[PDB]
Design a protein around this nucleic acid. Structure first.
Ligand SMILES: [Mg+2]
Ligand SMILES: [Mg+2]
Ligand SMILES: [Mg+2]
Ligand SMILES: [Mg+2]
Ligand SMILES: [Mg+2]
Ligand SMILES: [Mg+2]
Ligand SMILES: [Zn+2]
Lengths: 74, 225, 25, 97
RNA sequence: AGGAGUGGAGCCUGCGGCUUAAUUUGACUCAACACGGGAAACCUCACCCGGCCCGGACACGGACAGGAUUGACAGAUUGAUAGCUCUUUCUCGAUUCCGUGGGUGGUGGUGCAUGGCCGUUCUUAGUUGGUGGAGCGAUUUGUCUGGUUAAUUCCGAUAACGAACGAGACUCUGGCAUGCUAACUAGUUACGCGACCGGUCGGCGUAACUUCUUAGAGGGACAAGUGGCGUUCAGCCACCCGAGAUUGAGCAAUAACAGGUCUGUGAUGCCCUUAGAUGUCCGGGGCUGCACGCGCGCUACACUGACUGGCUCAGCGUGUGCCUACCCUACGCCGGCAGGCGCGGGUAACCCGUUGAACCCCAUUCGUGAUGGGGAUCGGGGAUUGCAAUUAUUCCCCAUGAACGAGGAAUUCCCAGUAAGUGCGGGUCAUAAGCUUGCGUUGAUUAAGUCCCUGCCCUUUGUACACACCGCCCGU
C-alpha cells in the first residue's frame, strides 16, 4: 500500500535509442568513373540472404543481421 | 477416436449450455427464449425460439447466416452441416425468460420500476397464468438497496410440481448506479394436451366424477332384443 | 395517473408522499 | 499492434471471405486454427479485430472465452478498399437467399 | 438412561501471537478456526527482492523513405543464450515511433453502494386475503378454552364461512413378487467332452429356461383386521396376518440480517493505478518460519493385545482427456523392497475383475513392563514424478526408539443395520490423504420419557421502548 521507493535499485534504466544514419552510400561504390559499382561489404551466403542483403564488418568478424550468421576474421 | 458414453453426454450438455449462453447474449433484445438442438444424419438443426423472428433473421436472412457461420466456426462442425432455424414462442405471456427480457428492456428504457413490473404482471395474468411473482432488487430508491415483490394468483414453492408447474427466470439489468436483479416466476395452468401448461394435474388435486342421475326401476321389466 | 399511485406506494412516507397523495385525490 | 503486413492481409481476407470471425481469448496460443499454415498468432487476430471494432467496422460479442466478430457494411466497404476488391465481390453472409 | 468419546501424550492440520524482506488474506458465539472445495516445490499467487514486455484500441498533430523492427560478439547480468543496457553495424520497411486526448485491465479498495448465490432465524410451524361480525379508528375475529398430531395435523367448541402459501401430498431412494416382459456385454439347470479321487471342476462346448443378475411395466400398506383406551370423534396402545405396520434423503412459506462472498465470472456502480504499472511475463524468497495460546483430527497407552504364518467374504464407483501434457491395468521376466523392462485388454455388465479389502476367523511366539505395548525424533543408504525435491514431494530398507500406564475443571455427537470398530472408492491429484464426500463389512449397551439444564415457540401480563433494552432516562 506504500509507495515503491525503488530509488535504491538504479536511477531509471535508459531505453535504447537507435542512432540515425542517413543512407546506404557506404555499401556500394560506383564511382569508378566508368560506372563500375564495387560492393564495399560482403554479402550473405544464406539462401534467403541473397545479393540484396550484406554483412557488417566490425573490428573483427562478419555479421549478417538477418540470419545472424557470423564469420570471424581470424 | 471415440470417447466414453459418460464423457459424450457431459460434452453435449456442455455444448448446449454454451450455445444457449451465446444465443442469450446475442438475441436478448429480440425476445430470445431458448434453443433446441436436433441431430439427424449428417445435419444439426438449431431451433431458436424468439418473439421477434424477423429481427433474429435480419434482412434477407443475413443475421441468421452470420449466426450459423459463427456456430460453424466455434464448435467445429463440418462445413455446411450445421443449420439454424428460428421460430416463435407459442405464448409469450407464459415464458418467464421472455417476460424477464421484456422487463429488462423496459427498465433499460427509463420506465419506472413499478409501472413496468405491474404491466408485466398484468400481461402474464391476462395470458392465462394461474399466478406469477416478479421481484426486483437493488438500488431502487437511493443509495441503500431494497427488494420489491409483486405477486398475483396462486404460486407453489415446494415439492416436485415446482419443476413442471412454475417456470422461473433470473436476469440482471445494468443501470447507472449499478445492477438490478429481476426474478420472474410463472405458475402454469393445468393443460390437458395442448402445451399451454403441464399435462399432469397437481398431485394433491382430487377430482370426483359427478354421478349421472338414474331412475330406480319400480318393477322388473325384461327387454328382449 | 397510475404512475402517481406507483410512486406513492413505493414510499408511502417519503419526500414526495404529500404531493402524490394530493394528486391522487 | 506491430504485426507483419501479410498477417493483417490474411486476417482481412478471411474476414471478408465469410464476414464473421471467431477467436479464443488466449494471447499465448501460437496459431489461429483457421489461419494456420499462414503463421498468424491468435494474439494478432484478436488485436487486429479489436482495432477494426474500435474503428466501427465489426461488431463483437463474447461468451465463454470466445470472441465473435461480424462484419458491418462500413467494414465491408473499408475492407473492399483495403484489399482492392472488385465491387461485385461480396462476403458469404450477403449471398444465398 | 447410557454408548463412543475429547479436554491429558505425541504427531497432522486450521487460527491467533511472535518472528520476518515477505511470512498475501477473507471469515471471530451457535451463524470463524481439515472453512474459502485453501493437500502452495515452480505454476497457482495475491506477499517480498530483482529484471524483460505493451498485449498504451481510436482520433488529432509531429517525424517519415527511411517512421520504426530484430539481432550474432565482447562487456554486462551487480541471476539468464534479457540486443535489458552499453560497444559495435547489419537487418526489417509504414505494421510503428514522439506528444495531447482517450482507452484498456488489476486476485487493487469498498459485501456499510449492488446483483446473483449461500448461510442463519428455520426444517421449527408458521403466514395471508375474500365475504360476514365487532369497533369512530389504528385494528380485531376467522388464526380458539380443550383433546390429538411430527405438523395452524385433525376432531371439537365456535360470529364466523369458505379458501390460499407453508406442513402433508410430491420426486428419488430401501425393502417384497418362483406373477409379466427378456437377455453370448448376466446367468442357472441339463446334456456331451475332458482332468483328478458317484464327488470336485470360475475346465471346454451347446440346448432349456430366467430362480439367482440386470431394468421396465404393473402389483403391494390403508392404522386395513382384532382387543382395549378415548367425547367412543380426532387418534393412541397391543396383537395376528404380512416383505414391510414410522427407510433415508431432495424440495421447501411470509418476513428479516447492514451475516459471507467485489478472491468464481466478459456480474457489477463509484473511487485508486495504469509504462522505472497495482497490467503482464521471468529469476529467486514467502505462504511451513517458533519462547507461547486455541480449534478439527490421526496414532496410542496393550493380553478382548501385539507379532508370524494359514484360511475365507463386499459395495459404491473410476478408467486412454477441445485446448491438455496427464488413463485403469491383466500376464511374462528382473530386483528383499520401493521399483524396472517387455507384452496384451479396455472409450467399458465386454478389460482391470469373480474387484481373493480390512476387521474378523485358525494356529504360532511373547508373558504384565514403557515389554516383542507405542512409534515421535534422528542417521546412513536405495528408487519414483517432475524443468527444479535443499526448508528434507512421495515411496522403500536398515538403524534410533520420546512422551504416553486411560487423561482436571469443562464440553461434543448420538435411539437400529444406529453408535462404534474396519477397510474401500470419488474430489484434490505430474507427484500425493492424518481432510472431505460416498460405499459396504462386523455390529451393541441403553430409552420409548421430561421441562431439571440449554435454548426456542406461544399465551396472559407490564412498559415512559417503537432506531424497539446495545432502548429510554435522572442528578451533581
Ligand atoms: Mg414436503
Ligand atoms: Mg371486514
Ligand atoms: Mg364497521
Ligand atoms: Mg389475527
Ligand atoms: Mg426447558
Ligand atoms: Mg417514542
Ligand atoms: Zn544472412
Amino acid at each position: 500500500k506504500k509507495r515503491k521507493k525503488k530509488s535504491y535499485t538504479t536511477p531509471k534504466k535508459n531505453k535504447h535509442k537507435r542512432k540515425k544514419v542517413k543512407l546506404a552510400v557506404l555499401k556500394y561504390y560506383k564511382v569508378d568513373e566508368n560506372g563500375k559499382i564495387s560492393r564495399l561489404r560482403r554479402e550473405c551466403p544464406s539462401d534467403e540472404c541473397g545479393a540484396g542483403v550484406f554483412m557488417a564488418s566490425h573490428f573483427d568478424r562478419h555479421y549478417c543481421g538477418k540470419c545472424c550468421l557470423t564469420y570471424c576474421f581470424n | 477416436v471415440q470417447i466414453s458414453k459418460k464423457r459424450k453426454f457431459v460434452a453435449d450438455g456442455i455444448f448446449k449450455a454454451e450455445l444457449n449462453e451465446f444465443l442469450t447474449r446475442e438475441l436478448a433484445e429480440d425476445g430470445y427464449s431458448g434453443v433446441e438442438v436436433r441431430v439427424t444424419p449428417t445435419r444439426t438443426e438449431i431451433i431458436i425460439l424468439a418473439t421477434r423472428t424477423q429481427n433474429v433473421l435480419g434482412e434477407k436472412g443475413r443475421r441468421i447466416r452470420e449466426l450459423t457461420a459463427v456456430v460453424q466456426k466455434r464448435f467445429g462442425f463440418p462445413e455446411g452441416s450445421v443449420e439454424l432455424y428460428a421460430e416463435k414462442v407459442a405464448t409469450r405471456g407464459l415464458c418467464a425468460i421472455a417476460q424477464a427480457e421484456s422487463l429488462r428492456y423496459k427498465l433499460l428504457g427509463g420506465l419506472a420500476v413499478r409501472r413496468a413490473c405491474y404491466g408485466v404482471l398484468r400481461f402474464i395474468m391476462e395470458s392465462g397464468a394461474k399466478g406469477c411473482e416478479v421481484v426486483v432488487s437493488g438500488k431502487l430508491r437511493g443509495q441503500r438497496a431494497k427488494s420489491m415483490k409483486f405477486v398475483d394468483g396462486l404460486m407453489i414453492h415446494s415439492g416436485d410440481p415446482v419443476n413442471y408447474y412454475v417456470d422461473t427466470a433470473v436476469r440482471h439489468v445494468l443501470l447507472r448506479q449499478g445492477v438490478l436483479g429481476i426474478k420472474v416466476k410463472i405458475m402454469l395452468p393445468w393443460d390437458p394436451t395442448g402445451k399451454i401448461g403441464p399435462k399432469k394435474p397437481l398431485p394433491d388435486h382430487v377430482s370426483i366424477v359427478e354421478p349421472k342421475d338414474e331412475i330406480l326401476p319400480t318393477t322388473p321389466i325384461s327387454e328382449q332384443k | 395517473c397510475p404512475e402517481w399511485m406507483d410512486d406513492f406506494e413505493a414510499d408511502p412516507k417519503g419526500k414526495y408522499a404529500q404531493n402524490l397523495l394530493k394528486k391522487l385525490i | 499492434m506491430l504485426m507483419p503486413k501479410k498477417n493483417r492481409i490474411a486476417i482481412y481476407e478471411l474476414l471478408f471471405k465469410e464476414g464473421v470471425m471467431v477467436a479464443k481469448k488466449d494471447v499465448h496460443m501460437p496459431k489461429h486454427p483457421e489461419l494456420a499454415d499462414k503463421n498468424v498468432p491468435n494474439l494478432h487476430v484478436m488485436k487486429a479485430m479489436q482495432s477494426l471494432k474500435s474503428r466501427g467496422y465489426v461488431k463483437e460479442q463474447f461468451a465463454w472465452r470466445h470472441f465473435y466478430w461480424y462484419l458491418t457494411n462500413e467494414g465491408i466497404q473499408y475492407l473492399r478498399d483495403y484489399l482492392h476488391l472488385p465491387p461485385e465481390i461480396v462476403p458469404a453472409t450477403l449471398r444465398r437467399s
